[PDB]
Structure 1
Amino acid sequence: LSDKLKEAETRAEFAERSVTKLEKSIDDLEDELYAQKLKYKAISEELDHALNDMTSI
Structure 2
Amino acid sequence: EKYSQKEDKYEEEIKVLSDKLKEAETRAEFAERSVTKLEKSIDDLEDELYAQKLKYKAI
Could you state the TM-score of these two structures normalised by the residue count of structure 1? Answer: 0.69
* Pairwise CA RMSD: 1.8
5+ unaligned residues in a row in structure 2: which ranges? Answer: none
5+ unaligned residues in a row in structure 1: which ranges? Answer: none
**Cα gap change, 1:6/1:54 in structure 2, threshold over 3 Å: closer, same or farther?**
farther
Q: Give the distance between the partners of 1:54 and 1:5, measured in 2 at CA.
A: 72
- Please identify runs of 4+ aligned residues in structure 1 that moved more than 6 A: none
Q: Percent identity of the aligned residues?
A: 14
Residue correspondences, number? 56
User: Which residue is equivalent to 1:4?
Assistant: 6
User: Which residue is equivalent to 2:55?
Assistant: 54
Matches of residues 1-57 of structure 1 in structure 2 within 5 Å? Answer: 1-39=3-41, 41-55=42-56, 56-57=58-59
